[PDB]
Ligand binder design. Structure first.
Ligand SMILES: *[C@@H]1O[C@H](CO)[C@@H](O[C@@H]2O[C@H](CO)[C@@H](O)[C@H](O)[C@H]2NC(C)=O)[C@H](O)[C@H]1NC(C)=O
Ligand SMILES: *[C@@H]1O[C@H](CO)[C@@H](O[C@@H]2O[C@H](CO)[C@@H](O)[C@H](O)[C@H]2NC(C)=O)[C@H](O)[C@H]1NC(C)=O
Ligand SMILES: CNC(=O)[C@H](Cc1c[nH]c2ccccc12)NC(=O)[C@@H](CC(=O)NO)CC(C)C
Ligand SMILES: CNC(=O)[C@H](Cc1c[nH]c2ccccc12)NC(=O)[C@@H](CC(=O)NO)CC(C)C
Ligand SMILES: [Ca+2]
Ligand SMILES: [Ca+2]
Ligand SMILES: [Ca+2]
Ligand SMILES: [Ca+2]
Ligand SMILES: [Co+3]
Ligand SMILES: [Zn+2]
Ligand SMILES: [Zn+2]
Lengths: 426, 426
């Protein structure tokens, strides 16, 4: 109730963690230079992690797998801390450059200094440079290694270590700071909360996108609640399965049934074509309709240029980019758009003030394209004595620039560093 | 059901296990190419083993450590069975030829196929071809890796897996078929009995020899029940120590104490000079007496020459070496000394028949020193057609020759490939 319609809508949204596992050189050697063995080892670990996170309304999906059999791609060392750091960086510049994934975990055969069996950036989930974690293949029992991985992933998802009071049952919980073969596959009531609050406050977007059945590289497992290649539906085990449209025993649709789950499926039958499946959430969202011959129901948004937010902007691919909200995202609450005069600094085409970067140079904004270059904000505070303040980033000079589609005038929005009319398909 | 003098005598003897550990290349990489780390690992493991086996009157002592930091000497595969064989043969071939030890254990970071976490020949202790075992550094907790090694060594000591009727408390025992991370460091009642029986019906001699304090390659540890360099005594950990003569904390004798161990040590004091500390086992043995100013009991014997074995041999360093028994030792029962004529082949000076080596050459025997070269025996098998038979080891050529002090002529014995008189100090 206290949660915005979006927050509640976010929490209710099923979660997916497109995971990308990585086995290091020692893992390859550890398993007799047998890629099949290493690969299988990982698959199993996943078969333990998946059912664990189901109780968190999160489906871990192995969308990728890499075994450094020819040689490691990062200086994996006894220092769990350094290893994590190097792994994350590699993951940010190398891996993410060729394979899109929500989180990556490193399974190494090396032995980290001290009792630590893994590390994972707290809340780093979805984050390009922090949604990672490392785990030592510390025990022969893969069930224990999986828990270790779930632990690290637990951190990535905002969860902390269980404190004395925290409980999940009569045995230790995944987030217990110390392992043991008496460890369960349950998260303490604390973890449950920490996670929830984390989600509410951050709402990491990436964990919302469901991977394609083909994106999953893990051997299809019937009963894991996820329809994988070769399966028609997955409602879990015959005992837990609650969908009459599916045969939990073989993961196949039952005679007559055309679909099992989905917004466009009622009583095991494709909803009539034209029937609405998803209503409009905002003034830029367009109610979705069922094709009638499919089980899914793609999402569509209003046509760009559609006035939104009391005529303060124009819809852009479902969103309503306002120059005001952008300042609040760059500097925080209370932040406001600097007066017009400020944007005139874009006509200088200097290091920060510009509109477009054709090749690598900087083109000064045209007198009528100023509000499309660098965004000048002003934190509405009785302290700040500067009306014009920009948000620069040495790494990305685009960061801090007026987002595309941002209303730069009446019936106009920024396309490519220029204030153009919103009456033209953009 | 009864126990023979030699058996009881053997049982009472303090047992020692000069262990040699070997780490594979993966172990090297598994610990960041840090020899200190790998050594420390092996050291910690021995620290857990020692106390376990002491309860068995067995003092484990690390007399050798070899880390294959450059390359493995054998092809360590995921097949435990094949690795055990390769290692067992390597030891019998390369290792034993470089350093003497009672038993070797291969600690590898490789993962064995299936649940197997180690392997070790049954009752192969002291055997040059079977006193070996392979252990997987499967867990991060060296405690479980120690129990694993203790388990394999257990087999080497004639111990077998525990039956559901065997116990050692509430926790599972070392020789438990399944390795629980809650496993204790105790041996089941069955384990202890099989061991006793094994020792009685075998009496592996190598474990009777105590390792010189200078042979222990492992760092001195006050509490390892072994008086190493810089220690006056070692009653184990200060917590378990029960010896009223030793300061378990400093491994120093307490005030008013002259000793803590020794046949000539009683109640922390030296037994008075003259006191008997050992009876004569055979006819070539002389009762031993305490000096009064020492805790040890030197085992003196009869002067070499004393008639023994019903006048078939002459005492030699506490033993009565006679060809009669030698043949039986080399070719089993029924084997008897061949007829004089045979020994003539020793004059041959050829490949096998000789009396002694200079360096690479062999000084053939002479008409009299003939019966002091290669021992000639013959099987009593009716199907036998050869009177002169020989035992020859291409590995060690000395093997098969007549034993020193062995009664050759009448009142003479073999000294150095020569039949010298027994009256002369040989
Ligand atoms: C690589 O590892 C795989 C297993 O991880 C080995 O294949 C297994 O072989 C056994 C028979 O000994 C089968 O019972 C298993 O089902 C197989 N595992 C599966 C499902 O692949 C394979 O032999 C190893 N490679 C080699 C030849 O060393
Ligand atoms: C090589 O391995 C040894 C471990 O045997 C490391 O030494 C340890 O260093 C830590 C400090 O980080 C101490 O707390 C431990 O007590 C040390 N172990 C012992 C007993 O030596 C050493 O730092 C490693 N070297 C490298 C390059 O990492
Ligand atoms: C197998 N090793 C373990 O169980 C050690 C135990 C431990 C860590 N710190 C300690 C301080 C005192 C006593 C024991 C420990 N803990 C770990 O590996 C945990 C480390 C962690 O919290 N990583 O984020 C991750 C694990 C939960 C998978
Ligand atoms: C960590 N894995 C284990 O505990 C497995 C369990 C196991 C062996 N055989 C089985 C058959 C069916 C199911 C499980 C097993 N056992 C071992 O590693 C034991 C193997 C052995 O007997 N070595 O001599 C050595 C061990 C005591 C250290
Ligand atoms: Ca499935
Ligand atoms: Ca829609
Ligand atoms: Ca000691
Ligand atoms: Ca004596
Ligand atoms: Co003792
Ligand atoms: Zn943690
Ligand atoms: Zn066994």
């Amino acid at each position: 109730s206290n949660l915005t319609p979006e927050q509640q809508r976010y929490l209710n949204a099923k979660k997916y963690v497109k995971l990308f596992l990585v086995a290091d050189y020692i893992m390859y050697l550890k398993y007799g230079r047998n890629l099949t063995a290493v690969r299988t080892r990982m698959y199993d670990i996943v078969n333990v992690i998946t059912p664990i996170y189901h109780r968190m309304n999160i489906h871990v999906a192995l969308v990728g797998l890499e075994i450094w059999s020819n040689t490691d791609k990062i200086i994996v060392q006894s220092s769990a801390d350094v290893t994590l750091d190097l792994f994350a960086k590699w993951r940010a510049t190398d891996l993410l450059s060729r394979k899109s994934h929500d989180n990556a975990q490193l399974l190494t055969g090396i032995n980290f200094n001290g009792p630590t069996a893994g590390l994972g950036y707290l809340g780093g989930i979805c984050n390009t440079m922090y949604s990672a974690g490392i785990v030592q293949d510390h025990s022969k029992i893969h069930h224990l290694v999986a828990i270790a991985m779930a632990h690290e992933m637990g951190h990535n998802l905002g969860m902390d270590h269980d404190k004395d009071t925290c409980t999940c049952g009569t045995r230790p919980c995944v987030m217990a700071g110390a392992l043991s073969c008496e460890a369960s596959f349950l998260f303490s009531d604390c973890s449950q909360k920490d996670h929830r609050e984390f989600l509410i406050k951050n709402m990491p977007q990436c964990i919302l996108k469901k991977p394609l059945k083909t994106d999953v590289v893990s051997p299809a497992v019937c009963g894991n609640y996820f329809v994988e290649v070769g399966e028609e539906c997955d409602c879990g085990s015959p005992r837990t399965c609650r969908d009459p449209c599916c045969d939990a025993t073989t993961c196949k649709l039952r005679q007559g049934a055309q679909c099992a789950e989905g917004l466009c499926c009622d009583q095991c039958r494709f909803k009539g074509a034209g029937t609405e499946c998803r209503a409009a959430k905002d003034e830029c969202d367009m109610a979705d309709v069922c094709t009638g011959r499919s089980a899914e129901c793609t999402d569509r948004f209003q046509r760009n240029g559609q006035p939104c937010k009391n005529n303060n902007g124009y819809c852009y691919n479902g969103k309503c980019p306002i120059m005001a909200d952008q300042c609040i995202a760059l500097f925080g609450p209370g932040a406001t758009v600097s007066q017009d005069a400020c944007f005139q600094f874009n006509r200088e085409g200097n290091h920060y003030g510009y509109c477009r970067k054709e090749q690598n140079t900087k083109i000064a904004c045209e007198p009528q394209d100023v509000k499309c270059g660098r965004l000048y904000c002003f934190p509405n505070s009785p302290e700040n004595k500067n009306p014009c303040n920009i948000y620069y980033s040495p790494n990305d000079e685009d960061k801090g620039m007026v987002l595309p589609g941002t209303k730069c005038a009446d019936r106009k929005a920024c396309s490519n560093g220029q204030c153009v009319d919103v009456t033209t398909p953009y």
